[PDB]
Amino acid sequence: SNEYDEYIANHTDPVKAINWNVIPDEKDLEVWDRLTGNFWLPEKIPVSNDIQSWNKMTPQEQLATMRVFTGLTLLDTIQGTVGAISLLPDAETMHEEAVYTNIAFMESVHAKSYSNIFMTLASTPQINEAFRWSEENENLQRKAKIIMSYYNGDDPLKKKVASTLLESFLFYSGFYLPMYLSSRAKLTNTADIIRLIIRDESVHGYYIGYKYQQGVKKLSEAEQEEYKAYTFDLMYDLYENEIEYTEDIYDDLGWTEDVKRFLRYNANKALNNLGYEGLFPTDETKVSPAILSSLS
Template sequence: MVETYYKAINWNQIEDKVDKATWEKLTEQFWLDTRIPLSNDRDDWRQLSEVEHTLVGRVFGGLTLLDTLQSQDGMDQLRRDTRTQEEMAVFNNIQFMESVHAKSYSSIFSTLNTTEEIEEIFDWTNHNQYLQHKAEVINEIYQNGKPLEKKVASVFLETFLFYSGFYTPLYYLGNNKLTNVAEIIKLIIRDESVHGTYIGYKFQLGFNELSQSDQQKLQDWMYDLLYSLYDNEEKYTSLLYDDIGWTDDVNKFLRYNANKALMNLGQNPLFADGNAENVNPIVMNGISTGTNNHDFFSQVGNGYLLGKVAAMKDSDYNIGLDKK
């Protein structure tokens, strides 16, 4: 018999059932931005103030940068430390969808903004000190960190750092504005909740194999990193939201999602007030609102073929993982 040089993936012999469950969930909820009728939001857009136009452009510019980082560097690094071939396949899926997310913001820009405004948004994004700082911190870990540290960075990015940007469209959705833009954001959040949970689960497998002293060292590093990222995020949030008066509410939302990130990693929450009850109920209502049902034969919302986006709740962060 010839010695095996390259091993074929066999989905009929699953080493980790979570790999299969995650693959199925991600493929079932596949979507593309081209299916969302963003042009229907132009009337709402015209009624927003210049301060709001600037805010929306900048938060989506920031989100584009983070999704670009995740698609170009994050998943590439995480794929270098996989336990199973199926896990590699899941990361391939995640990497592609991160690219879809990044492209989706450009679809929003091309619908709502002029060419000159788009250039200004990307210039601001590519030179903003707080955005560039968090990208540098996360990417430094991706390029030079240990495998478990890279997973922590990824979960912090997807379950925490995105949410200073997500707040804006969710707030407008809760007020029945920019509903099609918000549908894209809800689809992205739905994806990110699975990504964060899955990568957090893979982190926990490795973390539980460490000695108690090594676990403590990693936990100390993890919480120090979160403190540092939160400090930068507060400054970024202040820059974005002071003019519109939402800064305090956004920070509460950030603390809620920072605790969610720690939950995904199997760790204790950091912020005592980081719970849903302290988040602006308009935003929580925006998260929990179902999809708009557009006509499948003309303009198609996020309900096309795959059913509705269910209300976002704690169980949305559970993809079948048996957490201890």
């Protein structure tokens, strides 16, 4: 009766309802239609049909799979409950805000898909060991916290840089495994879910990077130089950290070198999304065309 009057007193401006009849930035409407139009749930994909394929896999291939997937789940959990949410208050338009609520939900759908996969293919002990592994792995925990430090920070442009690097780069040391297996005719239904997730992250990376460029372009030439420096600096730390994560997951299988090349291919794309030139020369980013197609 009186308790909420101080707030009313300090918020004289009117609260505004979103109006989709007037779109200040056409891109928002484009991404909204694209993202909502691409709605999906893991229950729709017959993961159960990958069982025979999953059982023929070696113990090594299964362990690697459990880990990269648990690592992907961690990233989506963060992005969905902390990342996207951290971008709302810094939006330029109300329709941009609507998009972020769609990104947060889809991230939760991505995270849930991995459990659908586990619960269909893995044993409870395997699942339990994987989540335990993700709680204790230093590289995984380190990339999670570095990203969360920015979301919990107070710089809006830096939140968008971390988000874009998480979306267009950090997931890839993990996306390599299912894409490759898919190219060898293994876990193809599981790959279908992965392709749906990539179709989403691709657009999230591009969109958030777009808002970053719009925001940073409003600063002086000199300030723009410091954000670029900060972006590359963050990429150096994330890349370094991701190289180790990758070695530990893929050394046994012996795929490490191909994953590193894929890491560099995607780092260039993440930087491009942020409006910057790539970091690695093209001849250092060779990816198999069988992996690139099944990617698309």
